[PDB]
Amino acid sequence: EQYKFYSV
Amino acid sequence: GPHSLRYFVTAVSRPGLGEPRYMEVGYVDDTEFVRFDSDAENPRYEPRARWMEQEGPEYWERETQKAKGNEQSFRVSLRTLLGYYNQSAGGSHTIQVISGCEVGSDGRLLRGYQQYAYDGCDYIALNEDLKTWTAADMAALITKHKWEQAGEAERLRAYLEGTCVEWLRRYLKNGNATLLRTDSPKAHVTHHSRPEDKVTLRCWALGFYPADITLTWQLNGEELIQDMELVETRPAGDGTFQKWASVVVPLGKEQYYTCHVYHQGLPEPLTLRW
Amino acid sequence: IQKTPQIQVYSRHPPENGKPNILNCYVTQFHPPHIEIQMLKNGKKIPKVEMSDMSFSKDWSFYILAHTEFTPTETDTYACRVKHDSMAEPKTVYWDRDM
Amino acid sequence: QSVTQPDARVTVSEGASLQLRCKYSYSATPYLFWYVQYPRQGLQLLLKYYSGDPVVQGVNGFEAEFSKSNSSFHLRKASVHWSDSAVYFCAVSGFASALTFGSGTKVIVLPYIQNPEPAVYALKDPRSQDSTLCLFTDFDSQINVPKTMESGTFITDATVLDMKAMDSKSNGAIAWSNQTSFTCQDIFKETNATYPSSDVPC
Amino acid sequence: EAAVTQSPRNKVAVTGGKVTLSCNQTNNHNNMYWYRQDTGHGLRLIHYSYGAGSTEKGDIPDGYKASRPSQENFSLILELATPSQTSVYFCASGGGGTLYFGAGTRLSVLEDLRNVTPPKVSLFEPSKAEIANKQKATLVCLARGFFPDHVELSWWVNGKEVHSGVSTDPQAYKESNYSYCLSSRLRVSATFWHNPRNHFRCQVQFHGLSEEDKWPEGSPKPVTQNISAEAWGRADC
Ligand SMILES: *[C@@H]1O[C@H](CO)[C@@H](O[C@@H]2O[C@H](CO)[C@@H](O[C@@H]3O[C@H](CO)[C@@H](O)[C@H](O)[C@@H]3O)[C@H](O)[C@H]2NC(C)=O)[C@H](O)[C@H]1NC(C)=O
Ligand SMILES: *[C@@H]1O[C@H](CO)[C@@H](O[C@@H]2O[C@H](CO)[C@@H](O[C@@H]3O[C@H](CO)[C@@H](O)[C@H](O)[C@@H]3O)[C@H](O)[C@H]2NC(C)=O)[C@H](O)[C@H]1NC(C)=O
Ligand SMILES: *[C@@H]1O[C@H](CO)[C@@H](O[C@@H]2O[C@H](CO)[C@@H](O)[C@H](O)[C@H]2NC(C)=O)[C@H](O)[C@H]1NC(C)=O
Ligand SMILES: *[C@H]1O[C@H](CO)[C@@H](O[C@@H]2O[C@H](CO)[C@@H](O)[C@H](O)[C@H]2NC(C)=O)[C@H](O)[C@H]1NC(C)=O
Ligand SMILES: *[C@H]1O[C@H](CO)[C@@H](O)[C@H](O)[C@H]1NC(C)=O
């Protein structure tokens, strides 16, 4: 499953 | 052998055109198995390989909400990037991220990576220590420190060394029966007349799977590296691949040229003579 | 920046006059993702060309497959015309059965 | 991603062990968290679980164990004392990056009084004449402080106080009533010594 | 560190009123959250944000609005307050995983603004019985009569706040229907007490009417203020 990204 | 689980993430802002087009594509050992596209009718995660259908309704729901969340996240990064580079407001831009894990036959994580790119240019990326980042430019520094300020590295590492690896193992189960598919190329050589009493010998490799293949021409034992041309392997359109390689030889002396096709589906490396 | 798209026009199966086949137009190594891909028969845009979903590679370049069902004759001509911000002029690459 | 804490209140004795139950419902593995909330402030993290080893050790002897089977994430501390008294929250994250919180478990850890001397002294406000108020103090932490059974009267719940003079913890309950009369004995009928504020001759 | 500051700490607003709770953050975290806390409901999400300019409804958005002007702050607007919104609110900043919380904001939404009232505080001195046989002295501070229960009880000995030997009711109690009471103990040796050199003071900061709030007239204005009561140590004759 996918990751929960954290904006730049 | 080694297997990998990887998601390719794209976000492109379309100023005037509205909200950015967002897309997530997942790959197991380089074969697409899930995709999400904001620009579809009912944007939801859906299976892209038949074996992914054995996953219940929950799976799709969970990944869709997550994707919907990841979508807003990138919606904001797009904007954040305009400031970091003091760029136009009405210009379209692109963010691409590749994130995943490569684990060995012994189940150990060989590699974990999350790489970013903005407008086709490396932006940031997680070192192989899975503890620090390598910014590309002065804008990437702002994110490096900010991500270090929220201990993002720690949590990315957890996904990479656990979740990713754990879910890879699960898809391999459902997919062994299809992921192992192998299709040998059927080779052959064609003859094309050339001026100056010369000739083109084109050796073709078709119907093969997977794409990894290798073609070479041989002149009396040695393989010709010179004026030998070969096209990018390309998709037939039905899951098989094609590729050819050619060389220019003088007429009346081609029979001293042999083509060699190296594909994993062959009991042995084919060998072709005009 | 921007990358120039590379194009290849070819068919699924060994070209046979009078026999149904699929004409492919594979376009790669381009960025930004925006692009217009049209396939042409005797110089006239084919009615419906199927476009695969778009992907991108390890080097960040996008790629995509366009195809149409066709039955090649002896004298028909097929081409693929691609317009992309990386080119000042759209490029048209004709199909070569021996390529 | 859901989470719940089935025990609203947990009361243990100082020096005892402790376990806080937390259940989560969820189709995948979620992120899990435990926070503490002291008296009049926000939450502070004790520990989290992202993935990997199911046993995570946190601040101040706290630790939890994620059990996929049981779908639980119980918190533990081998030995708690008075200061562990607080409100503990279990939380979870899956779909979204925000945390969903359980209703919470209030933990009451009873300090143990080596030598109770249950007294109910009479105290007055020197500025307000005939101002009632009884102080029940130095009693056992196990015993039960009675409450009010009508309007007009009031008694406070137990409260612990601690002096920086070696062991000096001591429970306390305060009472007062608008009633024309009725002193402390009559209100704290179940206690012990009820010393009179009757001055000692000199 | 991971600082998050909410302002104000307390608020006494009336139905129909306008309330703005604000959160300032120095954590430089991209995500921010606004929660309310109530008994039986633990904490519940109202609105969060993925960054400056981002805002999205939580599990209970109804009745609230939010604005994310910049990275540093996230506000929860209450254009039209209803007594249902009386509660304690907390904003948190987050970095993708664990959240950091501010210290909260008590908010009371009243149907009327005239029931509010400052506290009456009196200091009950220690009985000589306690002091006699236990060599200890329990001074008892009691606060009665305040309504919106936004109060903080503190103890001051010889000008300095003391903590050791202090135990204050956690929650305020309710005597009548618009009147709350709160008490506290302060225990010291008998020596420290009989010492007339020592000064003791109970203080009760009451959070009430804002200066920018209107009050009818005559009766004093139930504005924030500290009310205290004192006792001086003394000899036992
Ligand atoms: C506490 O002392 C008060 C007097 O200081 C006693 O008086 C009355 O108590 C009742 C209950 O708290 C209050 O009821 C509300 O008052 C109105 C008007 O008096 C009445 O119509 C209602 O039926 C009701 O009682 C009443 O206001 C209050 N009166 C005053 C003058 O404040 C009370 O009985 C005492 N409690 C105890 C337990 O002894
Ligand atoms: C209510 O009583 C409290 C004391 O019990 C008074 O509180 C305190 O006053 C000072 C001054 O505002 C605050 O120290 C503040 O520190 C900052 C930075 O060091 C400084 O710039 C200020 O001059 C001040 O010294 C102190 O933190 C604050 N204490 C609390 C608990 O907030 C308050 O003034 C009283 N209110 C009334 C209306 O008298
Ligand atoms: C999950 O909970 C089960 C009980 O629901 C635990 O199983 C027990 O394990 C111990 C050790 O063998 C026994 O003392 C109990 O009697 C067992 N219970 C039953 C129903 O047989 C298990 O330990 C729990 N897991 C975690 C991580 O706490
Ligand atoms: C999955 O299918 C594979 C064949 O595709 C079956 O066969 C092998 O199993 C052994 C033991 O795990 C491995 O050493 C081989 O490498 C496997 N071969 C392949 C092709 O992966 C296997 O039995 C199948 N599993 C199920 C449950 O039917
Ligand atoms: C919050 O206060 C801090 C200083 O304490 C300041 O840096 C920031 O600008 C403030 N926010 C608002 C909205 O005034």
PDB file of C-alpha atoms in Angstrom, chain E residues 12-129:
ATOM      1  CA  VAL E  12     -16.716  34.225  27.975  1.00  0.00           C
ATOM      2  CA  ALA E  13     -18.853  34.844  24.889  1.00  0.00           C
ATOM      3  CA  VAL E  14     -22.629  35.090  24.515  1.00  0.00           C
ATOM      4  CA  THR E  15     -24.943  33.409  21.993  1.00  0.00           C
ATOM      5  CA  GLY E  16     -24.824  35.105  18.599  1.00  0.00           C
ATOM      6  CA  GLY E  17     -21.398  36.426  19.544  1.00  0.00           C
ATOM      7  CA  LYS E  18     -18.239  36.316  17.459  1.00  0.00           C
ATOM      8  CA  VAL E  19     -15.326  34.228  18.729  1.00  0.00           C
ATOM      9  CA  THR E  20     -11.891  33.750  17.195  1.00  0.00           C
ATOM     10  CA  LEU E  21      -9.536  31.218  18.716  1.00  0.00           C
ATOM     11  CA  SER E  22      -6.025  31.436  17.305  1.00  0.00           C
ATOM     12  CA  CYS E  23      -3.035  29.110  17.240  1.00  0.00           C
ATOM     13  CA  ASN E  24       0.554  30.220  16.747  1.00  0.00           C
ATOM     14  CA  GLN E  25       3.196  27.624  15.961  1.00  0.00           C
ATOM     15  CA  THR E  26       7.018  27.723  15.880  1.00  0.00           C
ATOM     16  CA  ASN E  27       7.321  24.015  15.050  1.00  0.00           C
ATOM     17  CA  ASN E  28       7.336  24.822  11.330  1.00  0.00           C
ATOM     18  CA  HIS E  29       4.988  21.847  10.806  1.00  0.00           C
ATOM     19  CA  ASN E  30       2.937  21.678   7.641  1.00  0.00           C
ATOM     20  CA  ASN E  31      -0.251  20.199   9.147  1.00  0.00           C
ATOM     21  CA  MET E  32      -2.380  21.825  11.855  1.00  0.00           C
ATOM     22  CA  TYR E  33      -5.479  20.667  13.742  1.00  0.00           C
ATOM     23  CA  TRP E  34      -8.262  22.160  15.848  1.00  0.00           C
ATOM     24  CA  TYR E  35      -9.971  19.847  18.294  1.00  0.00           C
ATOM     25  CA  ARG E  36     -12.569  20.279  21.009  1.00  0.00           C
ATOM     26  CA  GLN E  37     -12.619  18.136  24.146  1.00  0.00           C
ATOM     27  CA  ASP E  38     -15.725  17.015  26.026  1.00  0.00           C
ATOM     28  CA  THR E  39     -16.550  14.239  28.513  1.00  0.00           C
ATOM     29  CA  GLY E  40     -17.703  11.056  26.867  1.00  0.00           C
ATOM     30  CA  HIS E  41     -16.284  12.215  23.525  1.00  0.00           C
ATOM     31  CA  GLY E  42     -12.563  12.393  24.196  1.00  0.00           C
ATOM     32  CA  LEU E  43     -11.012  14.779  21.667  1.00  0.00           C
ATOM     33  CA  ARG E  44     -12.712  15.314  18.279  1.00  0.00           C
ATOM     34  CA  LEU E  45     -11.358  16.965  15.093  1.00  0.00           C
ATOM     35  CA  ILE E  46     -13.059  20.136  13.813  1.00  0.00           C
ATOM     36  CA  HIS E  47     -10.757  21.417  11.054  1.00  0.00           C
ATOM     37  CA  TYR E  48      -7.167  20.756   9.933  1.00  0.00           C
ATOM     38  CA  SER E  49      -4.832  22.112   7.267  1.00  0.00           C
ATOM     39  CA  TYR E  50      -2.079  20.790   4.992  1.00  0.00           C
ATOM     40  CA  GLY E  51      -0.380  24.149   4.849  1.00  0.00           C
ATOM     41  CA  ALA E  52      -0.794  27.888   4.473  1.00  0.00           C
ATOM     42  CA  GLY E  53      -3.991  28.353   2.501  1.00  0.00           C
ATOM     43  CA  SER E  54      -5.275  24.877   3.235  1.00  0.00           C
ATOM     44  CA  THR E  55      -8.397  24.101   5.263  1.00  0.00           C
ATOM     45  CA  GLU E  56     -10.611  21.069   5.436  1.00  0.00           C
ATOM     46  CA  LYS E  57     -13.548  20.072   7.558  1.00  0.00           C
ATOM     47  CA  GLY E  58     -12.960  17.490  10.268  1.00  0.00           C
ATOM     48  CA  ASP E  59     -15.379  15.061  11.907  1.00  0.00           C
ATOM     49  CA  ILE E  60     -17.452  17.880  13.394  1.00  0.00           C
ATOM     50  CA  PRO E  61     -16.976  21.005  11.231  1.00  0.00           C
ATOM     51  CA  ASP E  62     -20.541  22.280  11.603  1.00  0.00           C
ATOM     52  CA  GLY E  63     -20.712  25.643  13.304  1.00  0.00           C
ATOM     53  CA  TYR E  64     -16.995  26.414  12.802  1.00  0.00           C
ATOM     54  CA  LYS E  65     -14.763  27.884  10.134  1.00  0.00           C
ATOM     55  CA  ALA E  66     -11.004  28.097   9.763  1.00  0.00           C
ATOM     56  CA  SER E  67      -8.289  30.068   8.026  1.00  0.00           C
ATOM     57  CA  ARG E  68      -4.647  29.158   7.466  1.00  0.00           C
ATOM     58  CA  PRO E  69      -3.038  32.576   6.715  1.00  0.00           C
ATOM     59  CA  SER E  70       0.475  31.232   7.025  1.00  0.00           C
ATOM     60  CA  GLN E  71       2.567  28.323   8.259  1.00  0.00           C
ATOM     61  CA  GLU E  72       2.740  29.741  11.783  1.00  0.00           C
ATOM     62  CA  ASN E  73      -0.966  30.019  12.532  1.00  0.00           C
ATOM     63  CA  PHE E  74      -4.365  28.372  12.095  1.00  0.00           C
ATOM     64  CA  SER E  75      -7.591  29.983  13.375  1.00  0.00           C
ATOM     65  CA  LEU E  76     -10.983  28.550  14.285  1.00  0.00           C
ATOM     66  CA  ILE E  77     -13.730  31.126  13.637  1.00  0.00           C
ATOM     67  CA  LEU E  78     -17.111  31.036  15.427  1.00  0.00           C
ATOM     68  CA  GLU E  79     -19.123  33.657  13.488  1.00  0.00           C
ATOM     69  CA  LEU E  80     -22.263  32.685  15.427  1.00  0.00           C
ATOM     70  CA  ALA E  81     -21.625  30.993  18.782  1.00  0.00           C
ATOM     71  CA  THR E  82     -24.126  28.547  20.268  1.00  0.00           C
ATOM     72  CA  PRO E  83     -23.981  27.232  23.848  1.00  0.00           C
ATOM     73  CA  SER E  84     -23.347  23.798  22.329  1.00  0.00           C
ATOM     74  CA  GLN E  85     -19.836  25.033  21.561  1.00  0.00           C
ATOM     75  CA  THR E  86     -18.930  25.600  25.205  1.00  0.00           C
ATOM     76  CA  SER E  87     -15.826  23.459  25.646  1.00  0.00           C
ATOM     77  CA  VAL E  88     -12.036  23.239  25.704  1.00  0.00           C
ATOM     78  CA  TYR E  89     -10.308  23.581  22.335  1.00  0.00           C
ATOM     79  CA  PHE E  90      -6.816  22.466  21.355  1.00  0.00           C
ATOM     80  CA  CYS E  91      -4.843  22.965  18.189  1.00  0.00           C
ATOM     81  CA  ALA E  92      -2.002  20.681  17.320  1.00  0.00           C
ATOM     82  CA  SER E  93       0.679  20.924  14.719  1.00  0.00           C
ATOM     83  CA  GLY E  94       1.815  17.705  13.135  1.00  0.00           C
ATOM     84  CA  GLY E  95       4.538  16.389  10.907  1.00  0.00           C
ATOM     85  CA  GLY E  96       2.731  13.481   9.294  1.00  0.00           C
ATOM     86  CA  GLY E  97       2.760  11.217  12.328  1.00  0.00           C
ATOM     87  CA  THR E  98       2.602  12.382  15.972  1.00  0.00           C
ATOM     88  CA  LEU E  99       0.852  15.649  16.938  1.00  0.00           C
ATOM     89  CA  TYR E 100       1.950  18.375  19.357  1.00  0.00           C
ATOM     90  CA  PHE E 101      -0.771  20.155  21.361  1.00  0.00           C
ATOM     91  CA  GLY E 102      -1.128  23.666  22.681  1.00  0.00           C
ATOM     92  CA  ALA E 103      -2.334  24.113  26.261  1.00  0.00           C
ATOM     93  CA  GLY E 104      -6.035  24.568  25.398  1.00  0.00           C
ATOM     94  CA  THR E 105      -8.676  27.281  25.559  1.00  0.00           C
ATOM     95  CA  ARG E 106     -11.725  27.191  27.828  1.00  0.00           C
ATOM     96  CA  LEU E 107     -14.734  28.713  26.076  1.00  0.00           C
ATOM     97  CA  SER E 108     -18.138  29.329  27.603  1.00  0.00           C
ATOM     98  CA  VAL E 109     -21.112  30.246  25.475  1.00  0.00           C
ATOM     99  CA  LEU E 110     -23.826  31.870  27.594  1.00  0.00           C
ATOM    100  CA  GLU E 111     -27.483  32.531  26.794  1.00  0.00           C
ATOM    101  CA  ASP E 112     -27.206  35.607  28.990  1.00  0.00           C
ATOM    102  CA  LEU E 113     -24.205  37.722  29.965  1.00  0.00           C
ATOM    103  CA  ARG E 114     -25.422  38.918  33.355  1.00  0.00           C
ATOM    104  CA  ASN E 115     -25.211  35.650  35.287  1.00  0.00           C
ATOM    105  CA  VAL E 116     -21.405  35.931  35.225  1.00  0.00           C
ATOM    106  CA  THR E 117     -19.865  36.838  38.585  1.00  0.00           C
ATOM    107  CA  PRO E 118     -16.471  37.213  40.289  1.00  0.00           C
ATOM    108  CA  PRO E 119     -15.506  34.901  43.141  1.00  0.00           C
ATOM    109  CA  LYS E 120     -15.786  35.523  46.841  1.00  0.00           C
ATOM    110  CA  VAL E 121     -12.683  34.023  48.426  1.00  0.00           C
ATOM    111  CA  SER E 122     -12.041  33.608  52.140  1.00  0.00           C
ATOM    112  CA  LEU E 123      -9.173  31.992  54.015  1.00  0.00           C
ATOM    113  CA  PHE E 124     -10.072  29.555  56.798  1.00  0.00           C
ATOM    114  CA  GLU E 125      -7.317  29.286  59.375  1.00  0.00           C
ATOM    115  CA  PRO E 126      -6.035  26.007  60.861  1.00  0.00           C
ATOM    116  CA  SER E 127      -7.719  24.533  63.907  1.00  0.00           C
ATOM    117  CA  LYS E 128      -5.398  24.351  66.911  1.00  0.00           C
ATOM    118  CA  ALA E 129      -6.260  20.706  67.408  1.00  0.00           C
TER     119      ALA E 129
END
